[PDB]
Each structure stands twice: as C-alpha cells, then as structure tokens.
C-alpha cells in the first residue's frame, strides 16, 4: 500500500488521566527513529516541535497528491497524536483545576525522521514536495537523503576535528571551567551547547 | 518563562559570552588552495574507416538549410554513392593529424558536413548548389592532393 495511511485525530482508546506538558519531549536530540529503515529519503527535523492532526493532513494530503504510487512508497515514522493537550474554557479565571482535554499531539525532537520515502526515484525528484512539506511543518525541517545525511554527519565530524579554537563548550561545561554550571542546565553537559530550548544549532560545533 | 519556549529565549549574559568564545574557528592555510596548481572510439573507428574508404572528399558549411531542404539535398546526393556526414570537429582535429593531413589541419572548423566519395558527381552537386545563392564549396582532398574550389571546377568539369 504505497501511500500515507490515514492518521486519526485521537486513538480509539482515550486517555482519561490528564498529563503535565513535559516539554522535555521536545528538548534535545531525538533517540527514537533517527536512522533509515528500508527508506531512501526522509523529512528530518532540524528542531523540535509538536505535530497536530492538521500537520498530519498537510503531509498526507500534500504528499499523496504529488506522488507516483507505482514508483514511490512512503512510511510514517512519527506515531499518531497521543499527548493530550488541554485548554481551559475561553475567558475564564485561573485555578479551579486543570482544563479539559482539547486535542492530541505528537512530540518530535530534533534529528527525528518523520516520513520515509522509497522506491525507484532519485533525490532531485523528491526534493520539491518534501521541501514544500518541510516548510509547512511547525519546526525547522529539511528533506534529507541517505547520502546527504551521512554527508552532513561527516561534515559535523570535520567541524569537530578542524577547529582551531582551543575552547569548546564540552571542555568548559564538563570541567566547570569558569564556574559556569551556575549558568548552564544539567542538560547542557549532554546537549553540549548545540540545543537551546527546542531549537537546534547546526552551525555550532 | 519555561525552559522550552516558542521564541528563542534570551540567554544569561555569561551563557552568551561562553557561546561567543567557543564559536567554531575554521583552519586558514598559509596559501589559499585555489591559488595553487566508447562513442569516442566509435567515431575514431567509423570516421577512420571513412578515411581509408574515400578516394575523393569535399565539404561545405551545411548549417544554412531547412529540415526538408536537407532532406532534398540528402536525396539528391542519395542519387549518387557520395555520403554526407555531420560529425564534431572536436574529434576531427586529432583525426587529421592521425591520417597525416597537414594541409587539411586548417580546414575543419565550425559547421561542416563531409561529402566523402569515390565517384565525382560533384559537378552535378555544384549544379544543385548554383540554384541556391549561398552554401559555398569548401576545399577537399583527393588522394593526398588538396582541391581548391578552382580545383573543384577543374576536376569536377
């Protein structure tokens, strides 16, 4: 079935217990689903954010529009909206508990692949509508091949080995050089200063 | 403000100074590096076979025609056993020095088409070319002897 299957608004089984918005599901490098698995092309996230239902319809709709099913198949990597984001009633005063569940959402961290592509297709064919899709996303994303992915990871190794700067963020943060963990997160010892909030700095070694 | 925000949160000032001091510095070399120092053999075998084939050769500037007009020229020279050949001079300039044609090295440039032959209908080809007030006869070479257009009048006559 070489198309994007329908992604529902909310699963059949509901989630009756409300959840705290643990925004560290946006922060930092993703662990789940960073590499390809029987894919050749993807929409890599250069930053974290939340996917709604409407985003999933933008991707399913505007990909399955411009797609050759006899040449190209595609796979969701990001699951269905499962995080219940609540909103209080409009123009009502604070307190009185936590608001009712409004709509569900997926968290996507940086370095996540969202939609894998595959088949008898070159990269330059699929750059177009995956760049349109990659621009309609809430976070900064990019259409990435396999060779382009290993290309930019080898680039990041080149940056980490070429720099004539004696002072990196890793040497300063982990050694607590300038007494500087007073200003840093404890996550900044593992993010190593490439992540600020939900954003991602590719240019920063 | 939370730790994750929608806008890029303002850093603490020593956070920002750390980020500026630990920027990436690229290496600078002392000298800039930019300021330092099948079909081809098909044409070689094919046209090299055409070299040994022809006793007489001629050539023109056959770019100045239409498609059906080149079809008319193709049929009127199909009436003879002469052949016409549109091929790149890019490979033909090493062709001439291979075939020991030193008087033919200053001949083959720009738009040209070969008229390789063993039997001269080239007078009657001139009779076809006299009705069209263009497309001149460029000099040929029968049996390692060069033909000027005056030599085409003499030999063709």
């Amino acid at each position: 079935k070489p198309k994007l299957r329908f992604i529902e608004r909310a699963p059949l089984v509901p989630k009756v217990r409300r959840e705290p918005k643990n925004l560290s599901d946006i922060r930092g490098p993703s662990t789940e689903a960073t590499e390809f698995t029987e894919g050749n092309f993807a929409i890599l996230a250069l930053g974290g954010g939340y996917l709604h239902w409407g985003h999933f319809e933008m991707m399913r709709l505007t990909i399955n529009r411009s797609m050759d099913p006899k040449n190209m198949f595609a796979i969701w990597r990001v699951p269905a909206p499962f995080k219940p984001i609540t909103r209080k009633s409009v123009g009502h005063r604070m307190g009185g508990g936590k608001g009712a569940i409004d709509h569900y959402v997926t968290p996507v961290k940086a370095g996540r692949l969202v939609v894998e592509m595959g088949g008898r297709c070159e990269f330059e064919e699929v750059q177009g509508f995956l760049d349109q899709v990659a621009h309609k996303l809430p976070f900064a994303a990019k259409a990435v091949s396999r060779g382009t992915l290993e290309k930019m990871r080898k680039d990041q190794e080149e940056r980490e080995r070429n720099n004539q700067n004696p002072w990196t963020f890793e040497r300063i943060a982990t050694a607590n050089m300038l007494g500087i963990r007073k200003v840093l997160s404890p996550y900044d010892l593992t993010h190593k200063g490439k992540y600020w909030g939900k954003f991602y700095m590719p240019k920063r070694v | 403000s939370k730790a994750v925000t929608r806008h890029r949160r303002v850093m603490h000032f020593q956070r920002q100074k750390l980020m500026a001091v630990t920027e990436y510095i690229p290496p600078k070399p002392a000298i800039h590096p930019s300021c330092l120092p099948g079909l081809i053999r098909l044409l070689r075998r094919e046209i090299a076979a055409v070299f040994q084939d022809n006793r007489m050769i001629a050539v023109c500037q056959n770019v100045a025609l239409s498609a059906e007009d080149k079809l008319l020229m193709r049929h009127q020279l199909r009436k003879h056993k002469i052949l016409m050949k549109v091929f790149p001079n890019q490979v033909l300039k090493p062709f001439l020095e291979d075939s020991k044609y030193q008087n033919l090295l200053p001949l083959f440039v720009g738009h040209n088409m070969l008229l390789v032959s063993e039997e001269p209908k080239v007078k009657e080809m001139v009779r076809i070319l006299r009705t069209v007030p263009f497309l001149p006869l460029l000099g040929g070479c029968i049996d390692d002897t060069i033909l000027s257009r005056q030599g085409f009048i003499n030999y063709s006559k």
């Binding site: 002072w167 050089m177 300038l178 | 000032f13 100074k17 500026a20 001091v21």
Partner: peptide
C-alpha cells in the same frame, strides 16, 4: 538585548587560560 565585545571575549579567554593551568598543576 546585549552583545559580546572583544574586551569580554579576551577577558573570558584569559580566565580560561588561568583555569587550564590550574588543571595542570592539580594533576600530579
């Protein structure tokens, strides 16, 4: 919005150098 001058970077750096030599003399 506040921006980082050359004074601030050079100051920060000479503190980092004193720190690195403190790391050296505590290593033996």
């Amino acid at each position: 919005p506040r921006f980082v001058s050359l004074r601030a970077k050079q100051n920060m750096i000479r503190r980092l150098e004193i720190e690195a030599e403190n790391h050296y003399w505590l290593s033996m």
